Design a binder for this molecule. Structure first.
Ligand SMILES: CCCCCCCCCCCCCCCCCC(=O)OC[C@H](COP(=O)(O)OCCN)OC(=O)CCCCCCCCCCCCCCCCC
Ligand SMILES: CCCCCCCCCCCCCCCCCC(=O)OC[C@H](COP(=O)(O)OCCN)OC(=O)CCCCCCCCCCCCCCCCC
Ligand SMILES: CCCCCCCCCCCCCCCCCC(=O)OC[C@H](COP(=O)(O)OCCN)OC(=O)CCCCCCCCCCCCCCCCC
Ligand SMILES: CCCCCCCCCCCC(=O)OC[C@H](COP(=O)(O)OCC[N+](C)(C)C)OC(=O)CCCCCCCCCCC
Ligand SMILES: CCCCCCCCCCCC(=O)OC[C@H](COP(=O)(O)OCC[N+](C)(C)C)OC(=O)CCCCCCCCCCC
Ligand SMILES: CCCCCCCCCCCC(=O)OC[C@H](COP(=O)(O)OCC[N+](C)(C)C)OC(=O)CCCCCCCCCCC
Ligand SMILES: CCCCCCCCCCCC(=O)OC[C@H](COP(=O)(O)OCC[N+](C)(C)C)OC(=O)CCCCCCCCCCC
Ligand SMILES: CCCCCCCCCCCC(=O)OC[C@H](COP(=O)(O)OCC[N+](C)(C)C)OC(=O)CCCCCCCCCCC
Ligand code: SF4
Lengths: 141, 60, 95, 291, 55, 235, 136, 126, 506
């Protein structure tokens, strides 16, 4: 297997991406040819953030609560499970029945974690607010 | 329906002495938020000039 | 970590410095110096000083305390009892 | 409410109720001496801290930081025009919503008082600017009732015929744009051709596609041109299929039902108390219709 | 326990996206229909003698 | 193939680099959520096809479909693969990253001129790539629709001349193009026929439904092959 | 020709019917963009109020050059029915430069398309790069 | 005494009105509310009040219907004021109104007379 | 038995409803599982059969008589720990419900027991890395089991980072050995024990020294043990040392084949520093768990002297010391949990805050225990006098056997230092005893109606209601008398230690 052709393609792809930026930088007319409002670094009304018209509080570095953080964390153990199936893909014939049973027992252990997640309802989106109806009771004397 | 932030319930004060306290309490809130007013609206004046402006409007 | 590091003398020393930046009648300020009489502060002048003292010590006088405080010593006592350091991020403490 | 020493506009000191016994600890000592002998130097020693952070009454000054404040402002396709919908978001869940309006406030009611009753009618075409002729009808009825006059029989049928043609026009704009916002783009295009056919009926009797000052106090501006009823009927024989094809993509779609079922539930008790009417009121089980 | 359709029947529709393919088929029908577009300015929409334009 | 595609997700999240734009930030959170949905499902479906051929070579997978196209034995997987392809490309009904009615333009709301083009080009390049992948994994790739027709056309040309191999490349890629154009049509087709699904509903859709189904098949398939003494080898 | 989705009032309804199948603005290459960054045409379709005027100016400034502004309807042109209102701007040209004015209340879908054609005719007559060679 | 009575149930089969659930004990709840309403009128509101006279007239009519009709549909079909779940809400609201009327003392003289020019429009006195 | 029953408990716990009663009954199920595991292990594993050493699972694991003894000890000590969460420790809901709040408590323990038992059995560098992470991860989860506690989550964050660095050092050492030799099986590596860099095994021990809180890495261990709840500190401060020290002895057994004198000096240097910090560190402290953390560091140093010598007497010394220290460790923490019922209730100076996680947090909270409960106070005194080394308690014989191995192998400096460290550490050990009893005669005529136990309602005013539950009191009684009366059966127990062989044979 020779990969010199592949290397040339990867080199071209990297150069190709810079061409799009270089072309756009050399094709656009200069600001003086346009309305001549100066450089973008000074046009603060343009370089500012977009908030649908009305400026609001600047919360760039405020914390962002995530309601699917547990699903994000559970992705990593399951990603490793899928990755660990790669060795069996190309060695299925040589391992024979012995490897097939080992491969099933491997999945029979991870299915316990899959069952545990189902019962614990850990995949559901967490919410701060809860909507509960309150029964109206009269304290008649 | 929950009221917005910093929302007060409208009330008619029948005591002149009580009204004076409410104005003084509101006067301090303006002074405490003077730096916040400068930061949020990106003013060209320091917070000291804002507090002078707030005092002038209250004294009117 | 999250504990007050103030002293009665340091709080009084910085309280005097803040009050000397105004147009007070007397520059001799102690614990028993009254705002209304010794310093000659009216309604709005007193509230300007209280907010200025709030900025120095990063404390907020409540409505009842601010509407009844008479002397500088009461301001010093309030700062000592109520001042707390602002909570830092997780990285500042454990790192 | 009010600035307190434990709660103000800038910070707060929250202390939960204690869930354990108030244990009394006295005479703290080490193997070398009493606590008071080393308490001066103990600030460098974390093992000598007398306050546990797990305690419910542990003092902590936490700055009051506003939630994610997103402006669903005028330059947003979801807003059907101009609306500064301020949302207090905790991630994406909505905690508090502040609809800011008046971006389209043009003082219509103030301007009407300077106009005669005939001059004031075109202002109503521009309030609900998709259901124009119904807006004229409510003002026309009010003036007619004040004038103690009654529209003749043919006039009433015309305002009824175009009252429902107007209702079809409004629901075409309302439902399809509601589906377009959710993500169904195609039904929006199908029904907006039906609007073109119906707006042609608006222009034939009045000369204006949208702002047809046709319904006036005391009847209608002009009589129907010849052939209008035949054209309206020919459209009517076909409009039934357009509704069915619209329902093919929405009514039984599992994606559409997951976006609407259980969303924005309004109880019958609360619908009346908030002055809701029409589909909002009738959706909660109350069969009330002004007609 | 009172469902008219069996669990296998309800699962077959659910797993095979019965109504989704129905919606796709209807959309494909319009692909073989005449569009409504007119070629302005080479063609003009309907007008009436009552139309209001330039004075 | 799978490793290179996962790098493209990192490019989307870069735009939300402590950005002052609130709509850009919200798109990055949604983008990460979608990745958790399809990545496990998409990867495992491709592994089942590789397991059936016992090879991780794309060209070997294409040649293994000479007698049967994998659409017939694995019709559920083709639907699952296409759903994951829609989620990966952030195409509707999974267009939560760039929902115009929700997040104006998503991560591209602050982009203009060349940065917008490159992101626009990359998104549509993924649509072609995923459409081509569907033709490869389940419809035999470049293999002819009819073997008889392929022989007849090539018999009109001499194999001693370069014209045969020019026509041969046109036919083989033409077979791939027709299958790829159908799914590129299907990418447009689903956009014009289905409303957008919420991303939190998508998370529950993949983990509760798609993952159990694909994991069930990854056990079902070796059981069938071992039962009939048909474990795959590379030749 | 990429306008920005900036519908304010009843003039926007006629702007939607340009995208309707009868006229199909997309056949001319016209796509409405939700962000000022991706749009070069600003169509002011509706009434501009004093409460809205600062928002309109900010959105206009956020459009990269080259940019054009279209004033549609009597409200945007000169205030129209609400000219003598206490809260209405008497013409969007008081805030942003206008390249073409489309008359009507509302202008018909063909009236707006004619105005776009006039703007495209003006755009095709631009000589930005020949101006640098001969005028600078 | 402590007669804790359920006014609005928060669970159960729907009634066709959103947010309104079926009441487990329709008839017994109305009987206690009606009887307590009649007793409260005779202890707080004087006899000459028109409000007291009218409430007793219809509360007794609704109490008689509830105590003579076992079928829930027949109760609603004769009272004609909505479902029984709605009648329980109406009984609670009427019971609380009597307590507010007693505090208001709304049977006395007009607390505030209007001005001479108050209800005059464009020169004509209404 | 462990693996199969763990899966059943995992599924069952997630199915039944969430309640304190079901969790406690599930904890008792875990107690039966460990008891069944002990019975099965004792049925098939014997000291005589395992003397030679038997390979298992393609030689990835190797079990001998030395390894088998620790596994039996691990199971037994785990049984005594589960009794704390499987039964009442104080009888008060406000205190005891903490143990029943987390359902995964018993699950995480069973995960760690599998790691603890298999760690001394590792015979490959690959499985060594796998098992050491299996044990380490289970300890992080147990430290963070109370996720509503600020200190518990902070400690687990500290525990994770320090252990991960130690795991990297362990992985770095094993990889460096593979680079030199190309082999992963330990027995194959022993063929080249004279041709590989023996200091790479010292890098391996450095990672293991971190995980047991050895100096200079002591600081994190003291901080974690003090912040963690007493029920959690009781486990994480003892169980990791049961398995890692046994593995260190095996590794040092292989290292002594080449007898690198430079290797011994470096380990001697760390032992010397650990005795200094272990003794002087606890002199000025006010927390009881902080005091025990320094006590744990000092005692591990004593065992490391036996491990470093690595002779026939070292096997006798290490096996005896680890068994008796574990029993003393359980006894002390069992008493600490119980005596929380005698804490006075406020009804203030120093603004002392005590949480439900650690009701006993300061040494002076043990005041007047001689009056409050004379039998419990003496039981604590016997345990403390054992840590001091007063004969004929179990602690004296542990130090007596350690000194024999140290002086026989020529560690004169360490033997003298360990005895000076023992005298220095006696100061803070005696402070516990001073708090318990030295004010008995002045506070005998005192009234205490404000204690925690006084809040417990009576049944009928005629039932003789014991202040302590049956199980925890019996365990304290049994362990105290075993420590006290070891002289009765000391000769036979050492004879059992004579038969524990690590490839000695003849
Ligand atoms: C890409 C690879 C291919 C992937 C796709 C593979 C396709 C093959 C799918 C195989 C699994 C299909 C199972 C269908 C048979 C079981 C379902 C069934 O029969 O119904 C469940 C049945 C309950 O009875 P019920 O459905 O409620 O009938 C009364 C309703 N009126 O329950 C029962 O009574 C029996 C319990 C089930 C026994 C069979 C399992
Ligand atoms: C529970 C206690 C069960 C004791 C079982 C001891 C044991 O495991 O066997 C002894 C073991 C060596 O056994 P082995 O040589 O392999 O085979 C011969 C056995 N006759 O030798 C060992 O390794 C055991 C080492 C640990 C010794 C523990 C001594 C007992 C601990 C105190 C028990 C307190 C009981 C508290 C009761 C609570 C319930 C109320
Ligand atoms: C006849 C019976 C005899 C029984 C006792 C036998 C041993 C006697 C020991 C004599 C030495 C200790 C007595 C004198 C020390 C007095 C300490 C002192 O005065 O202050 C501490 C000193 C700093 O001085 P400062 O704190 O400023 O006090 C004011 C002085 N004008 O701090 C210092 O500078 C001290 C030096 C720094 C610390 C050095 C520690 C290194 C190790 C020291 C040996 C420990 C060995 C422990 C072995 C087991 C543990 C490994
Ligand atoms: C592929 C598309 C081809 C058609 C568009 C080509 C535009 C580039 C030509 C140009 O920009 O020509 C005009 C220029 C200069 O004038 P400017 O407008 O100030 O240049 C602005 C462009 N900078 C940024 C490169 C200076 O002239 C020259 O000397 C070009 C050298
Ligand atoms: C062959 C591969 C391509 C097609 C794969 C998917 C086909 C549908 C699978 C589920 C069918 C099902 O569940 O069938 C059941 C349903 C509904 O019938 P029902 O409610 O039970 O009818 C009631 C009882 N009757 C039968 C007595 C009246 O049928 C369908 O909606 C069929 C959809 C047909 C239109 C779309 C077909 C072409 C799709 C677009 C081109 C790719
Ligand atoms: C063994 C055979 C395996 C079959 C493999 C294929 C399975 C497909 C998924 C079935 C389950 C499902 O679509 O579920 C629907 C889910 C979750 O719905 P839910 O919240 O559970 O509510 C429904 C359950 N009810 C009724 C009990 C409450 O959301 C959706 O609407 C996902 C819509 C995805 C549409 C993508 C279509 C793109 C075009 C594809 C055609 C070219
Ligand atoms: C879903 C339908 C899939 C489909 O139509 O594709 C299945 C088949 C063909 O492929 P096949 O028979 O599976 O194998 C390949 C068989 N050759 C050798 C003929 C290519 O297509 C058609 O004959 C159309
Ligand atoms: C023949 C084949 C059919 C057998 C069906 C048996 C169903 C048992 C069941 O569902 O068991 C029921 C339990 C508990 O359900 P619950 O929601 O907690 O309570 C039940 C409902 N209540 C609240 C009304 C009481 O579910 C579980 O354990 C969920 C885990 C199931 C496996 C999930 C992963 C699937 C992976 C598939 C392989 C790749
Ligand atoms: S000009 Fe006329 S149609 Fe346009 S927004 Fe104003 S009132 Fe509406």
């Amino acid at each position: 297997m020779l990969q010199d052709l592949f290397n040339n393609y990867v080199i071209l792809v990297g150069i190709l991406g810079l061409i799009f930026l270089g072309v756009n930088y050399f094709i656009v007319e200069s600001p003086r040819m346009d309305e001549n409002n100066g450089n973008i670094s000074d046009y603060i009304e343009k370089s500012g953030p977009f908030e649908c018209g009305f400026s609001s509080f600047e919360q760039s570095h405020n914390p962002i609560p995530i309601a699917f953080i547990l699903v994000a964390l559970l992705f990593l153990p399951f990603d490793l499970e899928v990755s660990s199936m790669l060795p069996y893909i190309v060695s299925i014939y040589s391992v024979g029945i012995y490897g097939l049973i080992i491969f099933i027992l491997f999945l029979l252990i991870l299915i316990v974690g899959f069952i545990y997640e189902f019962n614990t309802k850990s995949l559901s989106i967490t919410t701060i607010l809860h909507k509960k109806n309150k029964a109206l009771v009269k304290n008649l004397y | 329906t929950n009221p917005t932030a910093f929302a007060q319930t409208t009330r008619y004060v029948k005591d002149s002495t009580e009204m004076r306290t409410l104005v003084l309490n509101l006067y301090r809130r303006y002074l405490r938020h003077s730096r916040g007013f400068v930061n949020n609206y990106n003013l060209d004046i320091p917070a000291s000039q804002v507090r002078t402006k707030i005092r002038q409007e209250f004294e009117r | 970590q999250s504990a007050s590091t103030l002293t009665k003398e340091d709080v009084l020393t910085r309280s005097v410095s803040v009050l000397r930046g105004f147009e007070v009648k007397t520059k001799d300020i102690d614990l028993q110096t009254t705002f209304v009489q010794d310093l000659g502060m009216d309604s709005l002048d007193l509230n300007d000083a209280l907010v200025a003292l709030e900025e120095e010590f990063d404390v907020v006088f409540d409505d009842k305390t601010a509407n009844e405080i008479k002397t500088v010593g009461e301001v010093v006592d309030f700062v000592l009892a109520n001042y707390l350091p602002t909570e830092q991020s997780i990285n500042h403490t454990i790192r | 409410a009010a600035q307190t020493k434990d709660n103000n506009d800038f910070y707060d000191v929250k202390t939960k109720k204690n869930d354990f016994f108030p244990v009394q600890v006295d005479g703290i000592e080490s193997s070398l001496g009493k606590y008071e002998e080393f308490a001066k130097d103990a600030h460098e020693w974390e093992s000598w801290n007398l306050q546990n952070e797990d305690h419910p009454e542990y003092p902590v000054k936490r700055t009051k930081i506003r939630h994610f404040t997103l402006n669903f402002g005028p330059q947003h396709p979801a807003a059907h025009g101009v609306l500064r919908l301020i949302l207090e978001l905790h991630g994406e869940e909505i905690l508090r919503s502040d609809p800011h309006v008046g971006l389209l406030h043009r003082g219509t009611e103030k301007l009407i008082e300077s106009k005669t009753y005939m001059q004031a009618l075109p202002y109503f075409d521009r309030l609900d600017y998709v259901s124009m002729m119904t807006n004229e009808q409510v003002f026309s009825l009010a003036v007619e009732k004040l004038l103690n006059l009654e529209v003749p029989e043919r006039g009433q049928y015309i305002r009824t015929l175009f009252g429902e043609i107007t209702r079809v026009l409004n629901h075409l704009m309302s439902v399809l744009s509601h589906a377009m916002d959710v993500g169904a783009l195609t039904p929006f295009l199908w029904g907006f051709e039906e609007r073109e056919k119906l707006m042609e009926f608006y222009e034939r009797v009045s000369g204006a596609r949208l702002h047809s000052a046709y319904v006036r106090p005391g009847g209608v501006s002009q009589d129907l041109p010849a052939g209008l009823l035949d054209d309206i009927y020919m459209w009517a024989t076909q409009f039934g299929d357009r509704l069915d094809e619209t329902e093919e993509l929405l009514t039984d779609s599992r994606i559409w039902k997951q976006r609407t079922i259980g969303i924005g539930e309004v109880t019958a008790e609360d619908a009346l108390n908030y002055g809701l009417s029409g589909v909002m009121l009738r959706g909660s089980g109350v069969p009330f219709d002004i007609r | 326990e009172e469902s008219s359709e069996s669990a296998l029947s309800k699962a077959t529709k659910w797993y095979l996206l019965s109504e989704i393919f129905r919606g796709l088929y209807i959309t494909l029908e319009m692909y073989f229909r005449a569009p409504y577009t007119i070629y302005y300015p080479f063609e003009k929409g309907p007008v009436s003698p009552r139309f209001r334009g330039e004075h | 193939l799978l490793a290179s595609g996962s790098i493209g997700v990192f490019g989307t999240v870069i735009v939300g680099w402590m950005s002052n734009s609130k709509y850009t930030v919200l798109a990055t959170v949604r983008t990460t959520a979608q990745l958790i949905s399809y990545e496990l499902v998409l990867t495992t479906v491709v592994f089942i096809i590789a397991l059936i051929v016992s090879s991780l070579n794309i060209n070997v997978i294409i040649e293994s479909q000479y007698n049967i196209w994998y659409i017939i034995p694995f019709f559920p997987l083709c639907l699952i693969f296409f759903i994951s392809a829609l989620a990966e490309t952030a195409r509707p009904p999974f267009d939560n990253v760039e929902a115009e009615s929700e997040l104006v333009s998503g991560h591209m709301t602050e982009l203009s001129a060349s940065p917008f083009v490159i992101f626009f080009l990359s998104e549509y390049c993924s649509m072609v790539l995923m459409s081509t992948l569907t033709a490869i994994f389940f419809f035999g790739g470049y293999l002819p629709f009819s073997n008889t027709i392929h022989h007849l056309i090539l018999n009109l040309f001499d194999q001693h001349s370069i014209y045969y191999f020019i026509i041969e490349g046109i036919l083989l890629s033409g077979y791939l193009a027709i299958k790829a154009n159908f799914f590129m049509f299907s990418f447009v087709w689903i956009r014009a026929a289905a409303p957008r699904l919420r991303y939190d509903l998508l998370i529950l859709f993949c983990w509760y439904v798609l993952l159990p189904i694909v994991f069930a098949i990854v056990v079902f398939a070796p059981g069938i092959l071992y039962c009939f003494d048909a474990l795959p080898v590379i030749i | 020709f990429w306008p920005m989705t900036f519908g304010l009032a009843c003039c926007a309804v006629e702007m939607m019917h340009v995208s309707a199948p009868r006229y199909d603005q997309d056949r001319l290459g016209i796509i409405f963009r939700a962000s000022p960054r991706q749009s070069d045409i600003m169509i002011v379709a509706g009434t501009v109020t004093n409460k809205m005027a600062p928002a309109l100016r900010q959105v206009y400034d956020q459009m990269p050059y080259p940019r054009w502004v279209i004033s549609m309807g009597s409200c945007a042109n000169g205030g129209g029915y609400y000219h003598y209102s206490y809260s209405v701007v008497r013409g969007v040209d008081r805030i942003v430069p206008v390249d073409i004015y489309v008359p009507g209340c509302p202008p018909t879908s063909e009236a707006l398309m004619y105005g776009v054609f006039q703007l495209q005719k003006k755009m095709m007559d631009g000589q930005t790069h020949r101006m640098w060679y001969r005028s600078y | 005494q402590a007669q804790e009575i359920l006014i609005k149930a928060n669970k159960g089969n729907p009634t066709g009105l959103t947010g309104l659930f079926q009441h487990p004990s329709p008839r017994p709840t109305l009987i206690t509310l009606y009887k307590a309403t009649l007793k409260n009128l005779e202890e707080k509101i004087p006899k000459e009040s028109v409000y007291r006279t009218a409430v007793e007239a219809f509360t007794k009519e609704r109490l008689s219907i509830v105590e003579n009709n076992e079928i829930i549909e027949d109760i609603e079909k004769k009272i004609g004021s909505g479902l029984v779940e709605e009648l329980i809400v109406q009984a609670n609201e009427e019971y609380d109104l009597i307590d507010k009327m007693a505090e208001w003392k709304a049977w006395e003289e007009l607390e505030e007379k209007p001005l001479d020019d108050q209800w005059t429009y464009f020169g004509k006195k209404l | 038995m462990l693996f199969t029953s763990l899966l059943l408990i995992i599924v069952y716990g997630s199915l039944v409803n969430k309640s304190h009663l079901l969790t406690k009954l599930i904890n008792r199920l875990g107690l039966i599982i460990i008891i069944y595991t002990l019975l099965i292990h004792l049925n098939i594993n014997t000291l005589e059969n395992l003397s030679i050493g038997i390979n298992m699972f393609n030689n990835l694991l190797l079990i001998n008589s030395f390894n088998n003894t620790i596994i039996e000890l691990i199971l037994i000590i785990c049984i005594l720990y589960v009794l704390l969460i499987s039964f009442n420790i104080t009888g008060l809901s406000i205190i005891d419900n903490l143990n029943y709040s987390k359902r995964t408590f018993i699950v995480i323990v069973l995960f760690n027991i599998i790691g603890l038992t298999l760690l001394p059995l590792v015979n490959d560098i690959m499985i060594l890395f796998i098992i050491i992470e299996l044990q380490s991860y289970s300890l992080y989860l147990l430290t963070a089991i109370f996720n509503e506690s600020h200190n518990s989550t902070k400690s687990a964050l500290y525990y994770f980072i320090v252990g991960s660095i130690a795991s990297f050092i362990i992985l770095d050492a094993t990889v460096s050995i593979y680079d030199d030799l190309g082999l992963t099986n330990i027995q194959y590596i022993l063929m080249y024990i004279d041709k590989l860099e023996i200091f790479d095994l010292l890098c391996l021990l450095f990672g293991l020294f971190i995980k047991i809180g050895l100096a200079p890495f002591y600081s994190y261990s003291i901080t974690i043990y003090s912040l963690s709840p007493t029920i959690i500190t009781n486990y994480i401060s003892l169980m990791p040392k049961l398995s890692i020290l046994t593995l260190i002895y095996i590794i040092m057994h292989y290292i002594n084949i080449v007898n690198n004198t430079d290797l011994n000096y470096v380990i001697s240097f760390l032992i010397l520093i650990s005795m200094f910090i272990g003794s002087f560190g606890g002199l000025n402290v006010i927390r009881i768990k902080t005091l025990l953390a320094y006590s744990s560091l000092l005692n591990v140093s004593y065992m490391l002297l036996a491990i470093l010598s690595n002779s026939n007497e070292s096997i006798i010394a290490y096996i005896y010391y680890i068994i008796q220290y574990s029993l003393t460790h359980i006894n002390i923490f069992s008493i600490i949990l119980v005596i929380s019922i005698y804490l006075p209730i406020m009804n203030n100076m120093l603004n002392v805050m005590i949480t439900k996680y650690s009701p006993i947090e300061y040494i002076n909270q043990l005041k007047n225990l001689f009056i409050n409960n004379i039998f419990i106070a003496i039981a604590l005194c016997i345990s403390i006098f054992s840590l001091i080394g007063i004969p004929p308690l179990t602690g004296f014989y542990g130090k007596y056997l350690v000194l024999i191995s140290g002086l026989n192998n020529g560690y004169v400096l360490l033997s003298i230092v360990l005895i000076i460290a023992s005298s220095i550490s006696t100061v803070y050990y005696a402070t516990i005893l001073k708090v318990l009893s030295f004010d008995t005669l002045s506070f005998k005529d005192i009234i205490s109606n404000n204690l925690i136990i006084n809040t417990s309602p009576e049944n009928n005013n005629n039932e003789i209601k014991p202040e302590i539950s049956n199980v925890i009191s019996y365990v304290i009684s049994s362990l105290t008398l075993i420590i006290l009366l070891i002289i009765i059966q000391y000769e036979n127990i050492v004879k059992g230690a004579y038969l524990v062989l690590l490839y000695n044979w003849v």
